[PDB]
Every structure is written in C-alpha cells, then in structure tokens.
Amino acid sequence: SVQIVYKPVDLSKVTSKCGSLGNIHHKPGGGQVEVKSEKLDFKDRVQSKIGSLDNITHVPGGGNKKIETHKLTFR
Amino acid sequence: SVQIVYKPVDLSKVTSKCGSLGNIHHKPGGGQVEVKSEKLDFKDRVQSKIGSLDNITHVPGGGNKKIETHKLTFR
Amino acid sequence: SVQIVYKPVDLSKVTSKCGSLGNIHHKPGGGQVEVKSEKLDFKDRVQSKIGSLDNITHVPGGGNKKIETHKLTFR
Amino acid sequence: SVQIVYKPVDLSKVTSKCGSLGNIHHKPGGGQVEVKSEKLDFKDRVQSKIGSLDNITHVPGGGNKKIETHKLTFR
Amino acid sequence: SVQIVYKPVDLSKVTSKCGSLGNIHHKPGGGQVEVKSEKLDFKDRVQSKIGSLDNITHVPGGGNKKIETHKLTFR
Amino acid sequence: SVQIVYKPVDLSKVTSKCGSLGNIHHKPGGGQVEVKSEKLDFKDRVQSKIGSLDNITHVPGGGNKKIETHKLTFR
Hints:
The structure is a homohexamer.
Chain A: E1 17-22, E2 33-38, E3 46-49, E4 65-69
C-alpha cells in the first residue's frame, strides 16, 4: 500500500522595525505643459493624456510580504 | 489501501513596528496645463484626459501581506 | 511498498532594522513641456502622453520578501 | 527799445489708423504657488506679496501722445 | 535796438497705418513656484514677492510719440 | 544793432506702414521654481523676488518717435 506523508512545519517571521518613517515628498508635473494642435486628422482610436497622471506615493509602515504556495498533484 | 496525510502546521507572524509615520507630501499637476486645438477631425472613439488624474497616496500603517494558497487535486 | 517522507523544517527569519527612514524627494517633470503640431494625418491607433505620468515613490518601512514554493508531482 | 516776437505755428497731426485690434491674452500666475515658513523671526517692516499682483493689460485704441512744452523766461 | 525773431513753423505728421494687430499672448509664471523656509532670522526691512508680479502687456493701436521742447532763455 | 533771425522750417514725416502685426507669444517662467532655505541669518535690507516678475510684451502698432529739442541761450 502507498503511503503519503505531508507535514511541512513553518517557523517563519518576516519582521521589520522602524524608528521613524517621514519627510517623503513627491512633486510630479511642476513645469507648465502646453500643447498646440492645428490641422490634424485622426482616423482611429485616440487615447490622449495631458498634465500629471497615474502618480503614486505608496508609503507602507511595514511592507513585509510572504507568498507561500503549496501543491500536491496526485494523478 | 491508499493513505492521505495532510497536516501543514503554520507558526508564522508577519509583524511590523513603527514609531511614527508622517510628513508625506504629494503635489501632482503643479504646472499650468494649456491645450489649444484648431481644425481637427476625429473618426473613432476618443478618450481625452487633461489636468491631474488618477493620483494615489496610499499610506498604510502596516501593509503586511500574507498570501497562502493550499491545493489537493485528487483525480 | 513505496514510502514517501516529506518533512521540510523552516527556521528562517528575514528581519530588518532601521533607525530612521526619511527625507526622500522626487520631482519629475520640473521643466516646461511644449508640443506644437501642424498638418499631421494619423490613420491608426494613437496613444499620446504629455506631462508627468506613471511616476512612483515606493518607500516601504521593511520591504522584506520571502517567496517559498513547494511542489510534489506524483505521476 | 527791446522787441520780443513769439509766434510758433503748429501744423502737427499725430494720426493713427487700425483695421482691427483684437485677440490679446494675458495669463499671469498660471502655476500653483506654495509657501511654507517655519521658525522665522522678523524685527522690522515686512512687506509680503504672494499670488498674481500688479498685472496690467493696457490696450488703447490709439495711444498717440503729444507733449509740447513752451517756456519764455525773462529776467 | 536788439531784435528777437522767433517763428519755428512745424509741418510734421507722425502717421502710422496698420491693417490688423492681433493674436498677442503673454503667459508669465506657468511653472509651479514653491518656497520652503526653516529657522531664518531677519533684522531689517524685508520686501518679499512670490508668484507672477508686475507683468505688462501694453498693446497700443498707434504708439506714435512726438516730444517737442521749446526754450528761449534771455538773461 | 544786433539782428537775430530764427526760422527753422520742418517738413518731416516719420511714417510707417504695416499690413498685419500678429502671432506674438511670450511665455516667461515655464519651469517649476523651487527654493529651500534652512538656518539663514540676515542683518540688513532684504529684497527677494521669486516666480515670473517684471515681464513686458510691448507691441505698438506704430512706434515712430520724433524727439526735437530747440534752444536759444542768449547771455
């Protein structure tokens, strides 16, 4: 008879310590933005974006990640 | 007879410590934005975006993630 | 009879220590941006982006990652 | 006997002709203006000006000037 | 006997002709203006100016000037 | 007896002709302007100017000048 044993013990600790996390600045699109269009002709899907777009300031206290994937395929 | 044993013990701790988390600034689209269009001709789907759009300031106290996926396919 | 033994013990610790994490600056698109178009002719999908876009200031307190993948294929 | 003759004839004409005078634009202070003061100490007259100030758009139809000064000092 | 003759004839004409005078633009201070002061100490007259100031767009239809000064000092 | 003759005839004409005078642009201070001061100490008159200042767009239809100065000193 076939015997399957599966006992993965996990004694992990993704710790982080931080005294202070501050004084982050993010200034996108400081400069003047000018666009000037004359006698154009479009014929298909036009996606246009002007100014300051999709700007992210992600500041997480921790940010510790743990990705654990378990698998046991038995055909 | 087939024996299946499945006992994954999990002694994890995704801790984080932070004294202070402050003074984050985010200024998108500071500059003047001017657009000037003359004698254009569009013929399909037009998506247009001007100014400061889709700007994110995500500031989580923690931000600790744990993704654990378990699977046991038995054909 | 076939014997399968599977006991991976994990005594890991992806620690990090930080006294202070501060004074980060990010200024994209400081300069004036001018565009001037005259007598153009487009005939297909146009994606246009002007100004300061998709700028990221990721500042995580920790940032410790642990990717552990386990597999046990048995045909 | 002393004879004084004073007959300055003036056949001047400071004319101007203009078909059309239009489409003047004046946009001062388009950009965002930020000021941040911390732990200052003033001890005398403080004159402070922020934003868009003392901006002039003088557009005169004519603008023809004639300054004529006459004098006849007799000691 | 002393004879004084003074007859300056003036047949001047400071003319100007203009079909059209248009499409003047003036954009001062397009860019974002940031100031950040910390632990300063002033002791005398402080004149401070931030943003877009004292900007002039003088557009006169004519602008013809004639300065004529006449003098006849007799001691 | 002393004879003074003074008859300056003036048959001048400072003309100008212009079909069209247009499409003048003036964009000062397009760029983002940042100032950052820390632990300064002033002791006398401080004149400070930030941003776009004293910008002039003089566009006169004519601009013809005539300066005529006449003098007749007699001691």
